[PDB]
Structure formats: structure tokens, C-alpha cells
Amino acid sequence: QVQLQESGGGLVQPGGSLRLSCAASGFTFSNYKMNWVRQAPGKGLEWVSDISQSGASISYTGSVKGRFTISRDNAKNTLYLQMNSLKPEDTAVYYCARCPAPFTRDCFDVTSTTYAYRGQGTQVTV
Amino acid sequence: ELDQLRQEAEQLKNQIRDARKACADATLSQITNNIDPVGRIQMRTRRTLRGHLAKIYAMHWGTDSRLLVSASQDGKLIIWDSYTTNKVHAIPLRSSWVMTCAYAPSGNYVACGGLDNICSIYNLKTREGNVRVSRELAGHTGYLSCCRFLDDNQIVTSSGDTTCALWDIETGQQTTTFTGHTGDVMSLSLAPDTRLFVSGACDASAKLWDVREGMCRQTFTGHESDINAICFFPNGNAFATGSDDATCRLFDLRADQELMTYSHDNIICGITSVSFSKSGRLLLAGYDDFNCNVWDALKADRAGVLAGHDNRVSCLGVTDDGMAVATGSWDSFLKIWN
Amino acid sequence: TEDQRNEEKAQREANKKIEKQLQKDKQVYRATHRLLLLGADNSGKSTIVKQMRILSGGTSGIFETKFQVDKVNFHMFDVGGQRDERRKWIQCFNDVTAIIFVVDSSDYNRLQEALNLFKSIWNNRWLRTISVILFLNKQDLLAEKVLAGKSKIEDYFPEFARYTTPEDATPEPGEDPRVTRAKYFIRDEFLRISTASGDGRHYCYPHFTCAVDTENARRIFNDCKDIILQMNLREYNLV
Amino acid sequence: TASIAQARKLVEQLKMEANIDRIKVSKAAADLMAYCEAHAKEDPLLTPVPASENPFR
Amino acid sequence: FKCALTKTGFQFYYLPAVYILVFIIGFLGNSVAIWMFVFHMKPWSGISVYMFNLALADFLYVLTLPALIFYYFNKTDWIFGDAMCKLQRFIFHVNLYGSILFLTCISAHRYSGVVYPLKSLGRLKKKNAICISVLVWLIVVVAISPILFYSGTGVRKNKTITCYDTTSDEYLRSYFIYSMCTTVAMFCVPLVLILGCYGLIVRALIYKDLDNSPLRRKSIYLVIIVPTVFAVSYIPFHVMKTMNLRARLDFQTPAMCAFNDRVYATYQVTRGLASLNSCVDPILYFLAGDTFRRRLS
Ligand SMILES: CC(C)CCC[C@@H](C)[C@H]1CC[C@H]2[C@@H]3CC=C4C[C@@H](O)CC[C@]4(C)[C@H]3CC[C@]12C
Ligand SMILES: Nc1ncnc2c1ncn2[C@@H]1O[C@H](COP(=O)(O)OP(=O)(O)O)[C@@H](O)[C@H]1O
């Protein structure tokens, strides 16, 4: 049973730093590319960042690429998003998504609507 | 209320996990350690069925164990005589991307379907001698990924709209809808008694459905990625499942748990098709590479390899009497192995 | 076994007829080029399909449009009527001549999603050898947005601040440098994704187009001509 | 109220599939092994039988 | 009255060494090529048929070489008899001209697929390639059939058993006409065809610039060096073959003995240069291509 549980969030004043975490189970997690995706209220799922299997090849969306550093702990089987500088537009539900297949460079996550290998999300209000 | 319902669902999942763990005492490998290995089973390409223009996406044997139907995304359904390598029929399809084909157990009809979200039923035994579209089943909102003839009047079709459907072909209406899958349903397998069928989807879970009721009897969540292939064990009390996580898994319906995992360290490609031999001792699974591994289904040992396809093995089917295995690949070639 | 021989001869005759029809179908199939229309459903694909049709549709399932440039037949497929999950039904287009990727260049909010989709197409196992004809549509809207300046790309793409227009850029007459820089930055994002990987087995052909642009058929014809020229050169060991 | 309805349906499905009779995996494995053993001789794919007995050659 | 052949060492030492090197290289090259084409390639396309036929012709040329090497190393003395000499020279020449005509077929197929990649995609049939290959082989065999008659073994004043590639002195006058016909029909017209096709391919690849698609200068360089290799390896060969036939018919007098001795040496040098084709062709057509290397593990 593939499971992605997100923790961290809640109310944070603008300019604050917040560390979202996601515990992964049901898969190796050391051979999957991981993503952080975002759904703003009334906007739809939007890809925020992703990190490759080895932990390198990190990439961010332009709206956060100066912040929101993504990290991956394969030994602890967890994903992390450190949002150092926070803005009111960052208020959204943050989901941790897994790329559908292990050893692939493509990232065909169906952000909008339903995606199987996505967490329940954590609400971050700024 | 959403938090309470989610917590109740988590508690129910923990309860079923605990029940499965309590029922799990031995292991299939531990029990079959005393069973002699099946040996190096090597099959030979006794027929090569060529004539398709584009990649072969689907395959199905006839009940007579001689006639084959193959679907090619050039827009063709070719009925082959596998014994004499001749092409019995060539049916042009309105939509080229047909991802599934079915052969009726009576052999009178052949099914196909794909990106048009339509199951096309073709009468192979028309009076005038041609092949006509006897039925055009519509009602799925996603691509038709699998279809299996329950009989000449009923067909079960799995679709990319995360639903399966039992159709009455005579009325052309979706008599029963099977819902619960979260991802695209990619595979479908009728039980030998046809009272049940298991469907594997892209949510990394397989579901057992009662045809006469429409309710999902059980769910199996052993795999890690999208399930591409699924096949019932010859006994009907188990089924194998191939996924994009480069593993196959055997689930027993009564044990309600994984029994065995068929995987190797050197295979990192997804499984496109799975099948069982007559006794179920051998599980044949084609991969994204040019190969089809045959596994000792009781020992989890890779008994043998079928190689000879230039592109990825797309479809795999063991004939009804078990004499041969048809593997169709993306190189537009279908090979009979014996 | 005279009757058995007669049945065998009848089967051989039927197989020969089927093989003749299959050779004719092979000729027709190889003579025509299949194009996969991709991109966000909110801007570009339907208008391009309608423009090709003016130069044949179908709500049920795929929207198919057959057009002809010079004497060459192109069959373009916009895959509608499908769920938002693209990862499975897109493997069936592994053998198309080209993927025509239409991007609403004026929509900076959806530009990153288009870039992610382009990256997935480029790096997919079954689309590694397929070239992409990149249609950066709505160039008039992009010019209007750049001139008005209500929203800036640096808000959505911070690297645009340090971007300088390429030396090989060919601005149209009456086009201000700001529109040219924005347009070529948007193009260069996709081109950077395209050149990051591929090993030369596929190429990306970017074009700036609009709704009133009637040259899209010729652009697709020329890009497919180059695609099949490269395929021939690889086949001829000329590379 | 769509999310709560979906959650309620999932909870109902989990309740339905939780109260089923599960046999021990030892019994299921023994049954599958016995079926494979009882039908091994009828399986043509276990051995490469010469053309004198099988089709396709 | 016959010339003394002062420069005979070229036929005695240079030719055996060149033929030995050509055997050593081309045998391996064409064996690898045919192995890849038969047991490793796809069900084949139109161009693959021509490439396999060219590789086979080069391989048979290389297999014909060793008897010629033994013949040349012995001061042009033949041991295997008249019939064996006729068969060896006939096989040599059919392989050479079949390789030339299959190079022409490859060039024409490449011209169609490069200048007209879209218009030719329907006309690219494997069965047409098979028919054209069979026609090319049949035409080569028919046109080199007179070699089976002309290549008679003779005896000279030095008591040496010579195996005439061309003919004996009795039939030299008619063999000049036959050789002119073979050169014009089976080399000159193919030479013009290959030169024009590859020049048009160069023009297309330069003016189109391969658009912006992968357009590595390797493709243009190969398309330029293939015709130059063909020319500098076959034009001197045929020119000096006709010149040597004329010098054996005419000349043979003290007034022009030096000219005859010089043209004979140049003819031997060009005979070696033409043999170099059976080695250059597998490298330029298979080893120099990235697709063949990728299929080569
Ligand atoms: C060398 C002298 C004796 C002439 C010999 C003729 C031979 C070499 C020629 C004549 C007909 C030719 C064959 C015609 C048909 C085919 C089948 C094709 O799928 C591969 C090439 C192949 C196999 C050709 C190989 C070369 C060939 C066999
Ligand atoms: N121009 C020439 N003048 C005098 N003798 C020649 C001339 N060309 C060739 N010969 C001699 O006649 C024999 C046959 O010549 P030719 O057929 O041209 O070469 P090869 O013997 O190698 O086939 C050779 O042994 C050679 O020494």
C-alpha cells in the first residue's frame, strides 16, 4: 500500500520559515523522483518543486525558486520542503507526489483532479 | 467530518492489515522450498506471425487454441490461423489506436477498443462472409484498455475512466458498472467460472468484482506503481499482477494477501503482460525490454527467457490447452513459442 | 485428403488477398504522417485544428484532422475525451512523425505547467525518438501583455531579469525589443529543456504563431520534412 | 459535500471488504501447490515435446 | 619488338603488398558487415538490401584476392590452370562492377531519401530494392561474361604461365572494344550518376542546412568524401586500364617503349587503388555511421 503522509503547515506569518515533511511508505522511495505540488484556494494543483532519485537534479517553479528548498532523506524515507521566505500567495494545500514509475526522467503526475501516488496534503496559511 | 471519515478509513485499513497478518503464518516460498525446481524451461519460436504495419498492442487466443486475434495501432485486427501461419481475417478499424482486442469463447465475435472510448464488437460469422461491426458499445469516458467476452451477449470492458463495465451486447447498454479504482484500469481478467473478475489499475491496486452484483469483493495493494497486466490463476483462487515497478505479484483470493513476488535485481523495466500455463506452475510475463521471462510461479525462480522481439513485448497469451504462448511486440511481430 | 487440400488452398487464397490489401495499406500508412497535438486544453489546439480543417474533427474520442500540404498527407490527432492522466494513453503515440506542442505563450501562470509537460514528453521512454514541433501560440496576446506590462515574466520566471535576447533572433518588422526578448525567453525555456537531453535522436522545432497565422501547415510540413530527413540520414548511416 | 461523500463510500467499501473469511496463507499456498502438482502432466509448457505429439511443428 | 618492362616491380612487389593489405582489412570489415546485416539487423529496408549487396560484393572481391596475390608474387606466373584463371578473373571483375553498381544504387536511394524525404516515403519499397539488386547482379554477370572467354591463360617468352586479366594478344583488338563498352556502360554512367546524386545531396544539405535539426558536419563531410573516394579510386583505374590496352595494341616499339613502360606502371598503381575500394567501402558505409555502431553492441 503506497502511502504519502504530509506533516507541517498551519498559520505562519509572512516572511516566516516552515518545513513541510512527507513520510513515504509502500515503495522504496530511493528509486523514485519526488515532487512537491500545490493547490491554492480556487486555483488548482500547481507543481512547486521536484527532486531526483539520488537527491541531485533539484528543480523549482519560478515563483519559489529563490526559496522553498527541496530535500530528500532516502535513509529516513522522507521528503522535505523548507520554505524559508513565505508570502500570502503561498497559502495553499501542499501535496507530496511520487512520479508514477521508478527509473524514469519523465514526471507525468496528473496534478489537477485525482492522482494515485499523491498525499492527502497539508494546509499552509500565510 | 472529512477528518473523521479519513480516520475511520485509516482504522479500517489497519484492521484489514492486522487480519491479513494474523492469517499470514507461512510463506509460499517457505512451503514450496521442498518442491523440486521446474528446471530451465526454454521455448522455441515455432511461428512468427507477420503482417501488421504498426506496433501490436493486444492479443487474444481462441478457445480452439488455433485462431488468434491481434490488434495493431495501424488500425487492424488480424485473425490468424496459428497452426498454418495464415491470416484468416483482416478487419480495418475506424480508430487506429486500439489498445485491446478480445476473442469470444464461441469464436463468433471479436472485440476491440482504445482511444475512442468505444468497444467495437465485430461479427466474424456473417452470412455474407464479411466482418461487420455488430455492435458499437459507448458509455466509457476514457480509453478502452481491456475487454473480455463473458459470452456472445455479455462483455466486460475496462477503461481509462477508472471504471469497468459489464455490457449487454444485444442492447448495447452498460448493464453493470464497477467503480472504486482511482487510476486508469489497465487490465482485466475473467475467472474460469466467470462469476468474478479481477481488474488492475494505475492506483497500484487490483480489485475483485462480482459480475452478478457489481460490488468489489476485495482489494489487493501489493504493488508500488501502475498495474499493467493481470491474469487469473488456472484454479481461479489466485491471480498474478504485473506493474511498472518491475515486479510481478501473486495474490490469493481466499488468503487475501500477497503470496509471492517475482522480481530480479537486473530487471528495472515494467511488466506489460502476464499469463499462466495450464497447471499454473509457470507465470509468463513480458517486459518493457525485448524479453518475456517465465517464472516458477511456486518457487519465484526465473525459469526461462523468451527473446526474439525487436521492440517491447506488448501482449502475451498462453493458449487454452497450453501448447503454445503467443507474444506480440511493438515491432509489429507476433511469435508463437512452444 | 482432397477436402483438406481444398481447405488449405482456400485458406492460402484468403491469406494472399489479405496480404495484397495489407501491402496497399502499408503503402498508404507509410505515405501519410501522423501528428500528435499536445498542450493545455485552454489555449491553442482547437483553433489550430480548425485552421487545418479550413485549409475532420469529431467530438467522440479523438479529434482527428486530415490535411494535405503540397502532395503529402498529414493526420493530426488532438486527444480529447480522455482523463487528465496522460501517462498511459500517450505510450500509444510512440511512433508518430511529430508531436505538435502548442503553448499559450502569453499565459505566464501556465507556462511552467507547459514546460513540465514538455519535459515529460521529451524524457518519456517511448517518446525519446519523437521530435516536437513547438507552436508558441497567442503571440499577439503575448505582445499585448508585454507592451501593457500589467504582469511581468520576472514574477513567474526570475531568470528573465538576467536574460538577453539571442544574437540570431529575427524580430518581425514593427516589433519592439521587449516583445522580442520575452518571446525568445519563452522559446529558450523549451529549447533548454530540449537540448538538456536527447542525444540527437530527436529535435524541437519552435515556431511563433497566432490565430490569424495561416502558415502553420507549411511550418508543420517543413518540420516533418526535416524530421524524416534526419531519420533517413540516421538510416543511411550519414547521421 | 463531494469529498465527504467519497470518504463515506471508501469507508463503506473498507467495511465491506474487512468482514470476509480469510484462510491462512499456508492453506492457500498448499492449495495452489496441490493444483500445480495435480495438473503438471497436462501442462505442455513444462517440457519441449517433439513434433510427433504437439502442433506448431 | 615487345618492351622489356623495366618497371615490372610494381606488378611484382607493389601489387602483392597492396592486395595483401586489402585482403587483411576488407575480409574482416565485410565479414563484420555481413554478420551484422544478416544475424543482427532488422527485417531490412530498401537501403539495407543495397548495403548488404555491396558488402557481399566487396567480401567476394576480397576472397578472390588471394589467388591474385599468389599469381603476382610469382612474377605473374599462374599455377591453377586456364579454367581457374578464367573463373578467378571473372569473379574479380563481377565483384568489382557489382560493387560499383550497388554504390550507384545506394547513392540513388540516398538522393531520393535526402532531397525528397517526404515524396519518397511511399516509393521506398523493400521489394523494389530486391528487384533492383537482382537486376544489378544479373546485368553485371551478363556484361562480365566475356571475361570468361577473354581471360585465357597464356605462355610468354620467359616460360612463365601468365593469367591474363584482360586477354591474350590475339583478341586484344576486340577486347579493347569490349572494355570500352564495359567502362562506359558499367562505370562511366554509374560514375556520372553517383557524382550527380551526391552533388545534389550536398546542395540540399547545404541550402536546407538540414534546417536546424541535428545537422552535424559529419554528414556533409561523409557525403563529400564518398564521391571523392569513389572517383580517386576508380577513375584512374579505368583511365589507365584503357591506356594500357591502347599501349599493348599500339606502341610496342623502341620509339615509344618508355611511354609504354610508364603507363604500365601507372596501370598497376591504379589496379591497387581500385582494390582499395573493397576496404574503404565498409568503413565509409558501415563503420563511419553511428546507427551501425549502435547496432554493433
Ligand atoms: C558472384 C557471382 C557468381 C554471382 C552470384 C550472384 C549472387 C551473389 C547474387 C544473385 C542474387 C542475389 C540475391 C538476391 C536475393 C537476395 C534476398 C535478399 O533478402 C538478400 C540479398 C539476396 C540474398 C541477394 C544476394 C546476392 C545474390 C545471391
Ligand atoms: N603495356 C604493357 N606492355 C608490355 N607488357 C605488358 C603491358 N601490360 C601488361 N604486360 C604484361 O602482360 C601480362 C598480362 O598483363 P595484364 O593482363 O595487363 O596484367 P595481369 O597479368 O596482372 O592481368 C603481365 O604479366 C604483364 O607483365
Side-chain angles (χ1 to χ4, degrees), chain A residues 1-3 5 25-29 31-32 95 98-103 114-117 120-121, chain B residues 6 10 13 17 162 182-183 201-204 221-227 244-246 267-269:
Chain A
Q1 169 82 63
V2 170
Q3 169 246 18
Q5 183 60 49
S25 74
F27 56 97
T28 312
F29 179 82
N31 62 339
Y32 282 99
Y95 306 84
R98 173 172 70 64
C99 72
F103 319 101
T114 54
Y115 179 55
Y117 322 114
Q120 94 282 313
Chain B
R6 281 176 168 174
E10 293 302 305
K13 284 181 190 171
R17 282 163 164 169
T162 74
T182 298
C202 287
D203 47 12
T221 53
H223 276 290
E224 310 181 337
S225 188
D226 322 295
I227 284 157
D244 274 347
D245 64 355
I267 52 185
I268 58 146
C269 53

Side-chain angles (χ1 to χ4, degrees), chain E residues 257-258 260 263-278:
Chain E
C257 199
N260 161 89
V263 304
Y264 152 84
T266 61
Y267 172 53
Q268 309 314 314
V269 174
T270 55
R271 281 213 265 194
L273 292 181
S275 75
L276 290 178
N277 286 105
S278 67

Side-chain angles (χ1 to χ4, degrees), chain B residues 15-267:
Chain B
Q15 174 182 350
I16 72 186
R17 282 163 164 169
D18 290 351
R20 287 168 178 174
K21 288 200 303 275
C23 292
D25 44 352
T27 295
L28 177 51
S29 60
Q30 295 286 348
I31 282 172
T32 61
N33 272 136
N34 56 6
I35 292 297
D36 301 324
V38 89
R40 202 72 189 165
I41 286 177
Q42 291 299 116
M43 307 179 189
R44 290 290 177 260
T45 309
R46 300 211 175 174
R47 304 265 186 290
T48 301
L49 309 188
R50 43 172 59 95
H52 276 310
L53 321 175
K55 55 175 176 291
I56 301 178
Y57 226 90
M59 199 60 58
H60 203 206
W61 278 103
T63 303
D64 55 7
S65 304
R66 176 174 179 161
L67 289 184
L68 258 163
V69 64
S70 59
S72 181
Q73 296 224 322
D74 46 55
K76 275 289 178 184
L77 284 172
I78 298 183
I79 304 283
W80 314 78
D81 197 295
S82 62
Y83 280 16
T84 62
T85 203
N86 287 167
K87 299 174 181 74
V88 180
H89 285 110
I91 307 153
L93 310 175
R94 283 169 289 119
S95 88
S96 53
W97 306 271
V98 154
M99 313 160 85
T100 185
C101 70
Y103 218 134
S106 65
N108 276 234
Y109 296 91
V110 129
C112 82
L115 289 189
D116 46 2
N117 323 326
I118 281 158
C119 192
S120 192
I121 316 294
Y122 297 94
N123 196 348
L124 300 178
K125 310 295 186 172
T126 66
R127 301 307 100 91
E128 51 268 40
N130 288 327
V131 177
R132 283 164 56 201
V133 200
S134 74
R135 190 61 64 209
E136 190 181 30
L137 307 163
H140 275 306
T141 59
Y143 60 87
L144 225 278
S145 69
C146 197
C147 55
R148 279 298 162 265
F149 269 99
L150 216 80
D151 46 63
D152 282 0
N153 320 306
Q154 289 190 315
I155 181 162
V156 199
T157 62
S158 97
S159 162
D161 64 355
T162 74
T163 70
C164 310
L166 166 75
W167 308 77
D168 186 85
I169 303 180
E170 325 149 302
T171 59
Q173 284 171 1
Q174 191 173 114
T175 45
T176 303
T177 315
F178 306 90
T179 55
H181 269 316
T182 298
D184 315 302
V185 195
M186 294 308 301
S187 44
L188 193 144
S189 196
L190 294 178
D193 64 346
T194 67
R195 289 184 291 179
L196 304 171
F197 79 96
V198 183
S199 67
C202 287
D203 47 12
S205 80
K207 297 174 100 76
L208 170 75
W209 320 87
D210 204 315
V211 182
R212 311 161 293 181
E213 303 192 334
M215 179 180 288
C216 175
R217 310 301 286 204
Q218 201 41 253
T219 309
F220 309 83
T221 53
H223 276 290
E224 310 181 337
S225 188
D226 322 295
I227 284 157
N228 311 316
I230 211 173
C231 193
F232 250 111
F233 192 80
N235 200 10
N237 291 333
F239 67 95
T241 318
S243 271
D244 274 347
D245 64 355
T247 69
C248 304
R249 288 168 209 257
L250 183 83
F251 307 84
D252 192 286
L253 303 193
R254 309 166 295 158
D256 196 356
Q257 185 69 298
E258 274 186 74
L259 255 58
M260 193 85 98
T261 298
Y262 318 92
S263 65
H264 218 258
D265 54 348
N266 60 347
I267 52 185

Side-chain angles (χ1 to χ4, degrees), chain E residues 44 52-53 56 60 91 94-95 130 133-134 137 141:
Chain E
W44 280 1
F52 167 76
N53 282 126
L56 178 66
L60 298 179
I91 292 296
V94 299
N95 293 328
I130 302 286
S133 164
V134 170
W137 274 121
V141 163

Side-chain angles (χ1 to χ4, degrees), chain E residues 81-83 85-101:
Chain E
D82 183 72
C85 160
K86 276 163 166 162
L87 173 86
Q88 204 75 5
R89 300 306 210 161
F90 168 81
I91 292 296
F92 182 94
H93 279 275
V94 299
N95 293 328
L96 188 128
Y97 282 102
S99 86
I100 285 172
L101 282 176

Side-chain angles (χ1 to χ4, degrees), chain C residues 125-139:
Chain C
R125 251 281 292 268
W126 318 111
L127 322 176
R128 295 279 176 70
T129 60
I130 301 167
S131 297
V132 178
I133 302 168
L134 182 78
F135 276 175
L136 303 166
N137 201 20
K138 312 303 184 184
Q139 282 296 324

